[PDB]
Amino acid sequence: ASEGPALYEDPPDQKTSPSGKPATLKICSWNVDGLRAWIKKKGLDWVKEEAPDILCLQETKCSENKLPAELQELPGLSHQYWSAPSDKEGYSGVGLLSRQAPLKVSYGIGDEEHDQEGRVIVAEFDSFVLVTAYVPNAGRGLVRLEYRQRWDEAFRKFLKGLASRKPLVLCGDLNVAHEEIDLRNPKGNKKNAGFTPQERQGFGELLQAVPLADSFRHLYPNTPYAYTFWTYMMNARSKNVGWRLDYFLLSHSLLPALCDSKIRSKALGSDHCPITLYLAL
Numbered sequence: 296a297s298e299g300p301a302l303y304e305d306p307p308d309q310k311t312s313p314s315g316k317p318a319t320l321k322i323c324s325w326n327v328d329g330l331r332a333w334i335k336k337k338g339l340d341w342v343k344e345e346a347p348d349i350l351c352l353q354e355t356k357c358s359e360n361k362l363p364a365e366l367q368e369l370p371g372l373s374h375q376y377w378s379a380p381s382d383k384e385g386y387s388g389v390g391l392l393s394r395q396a397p398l399k400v401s402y403g404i405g406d407e408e409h410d411q412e413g414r415v416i417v418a419e420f421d422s423f424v425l426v427t428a429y430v431p432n433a434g435r436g437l438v439r440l441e442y443r444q445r446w447d448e449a450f451r452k453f454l455k456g457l458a459s460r461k462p463l464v465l466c467g468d469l470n471v472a473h474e475e476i477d478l479r480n481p482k483g484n485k486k487n488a489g490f491t492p493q494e495r496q497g498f499g500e501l502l503q504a505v506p507l508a509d510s511f512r513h514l515y516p517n518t519p520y521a522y523t524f525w526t527y528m529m530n531a532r533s534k535n536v537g538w539r540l541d542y543f544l545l546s547h548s549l550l551p552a553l554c555d556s557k558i559r560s561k562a563l564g565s566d567h568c569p570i571t572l573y574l575a576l
Contacts, residue, residue, distance in 0.1 A: 298536045300534050301534075301535045302520065303558075309554050310573055311575070320574045321348050322350075322351065323345050323569050323570070323572075324571075326353040326429070326468040327564065328567070329356040330356060330363055336563060341564065342372075343369070348393070348395075349418075355388035371394055372393060374394070376392075377390050378402045380412045381413070389414060391416045397425075399417075400419075401419075402417070404450055408449070412431070415429075417457070426464070426465045430443075430446065432489075435488070440494075443494065447500070451500060451501050454501070455504055458507075462549050463544075464546075465542070465543070465544040465545075469542050470489055471498050472538045473498045473539075480536065489538055506546075508544065508547055511556040521558055522539050523537070523567050524538045524539075541568075543556055553575075
């Protein structure tokens with residue numbers, strides 16, 4: 296009610312690193328709010344236009360066994376891996392589609408308690424490991440906040456492990472706006488899923504512990520009104536009343552390779568927009 300439109304125009308794509316090296320890897324990440332729904336909403340059209348080397352998808356709501364045939368229309372992303380809840384139903388779920396086959400693909404974070412909801416894919420490549428995640432939402436009334444805190448600890452420790460062996464890129468819907476600058480209405484959301492002190496603290500712990508850097512915030516430290524999610528309700532997207540819930544987090548050692556971290560504000564298909572990373576590896 297108290298917010299009108301706040302302008303945001305994502306800057307042009309910077310496709311060369313600070314050292315002049317052209318980007319060699321383009322990763323796109325997107326919470327699609329259901330693979331089938333997203334496809335009907337022309338989601339694949341943007342993907343073909345963006346032409347990433349790797350596409351990471353969250354909330355596919357679909358198992359490896361029940362994918363839409365339409366996914367075959369992505370010839371440039373022929374290596375496709377999917378995680379879904381082990382109960383076999385249509386919620387959560389993540390996907391990773393890649394131009395080249397990873398050295399290894401794994402699912403989950405090595406912890407039975409946290410591996411039943413199809414939330415994580417790990418794709419190891421030559422010079423780095425990519426993790427895509429759909430982090431547990433704290434829930435209406437914060438009924439799942441206790442579990443989210445358990446997830447946060449387990450996930451941090453897991454990622455700390457991976458990074459100790461290879462440079463890490465983490466992307467996806469992390470279900471938290473880190474700082475006040477990461478959402479339009481910080482004041483009235485401090486007791487809502489996505490902006491509780493607990494969740495924000497967990498994110499801070501993640502950055503320090505692994506450690507990881509927030510690619511977007513690193514490049515644009517003072518830039519407000521840059522969001523990746525808007526509730527479907529209340530003309531929230533038209534007014535740019537949103538949250539930045541989608542990230543690329545990078546091992547510090549990968550910062551010199553960082554060209555840009557983009558937010559594709561205008562791409563439709565879901566209640567989130569795509570984000571895109573350019574790396575010079």
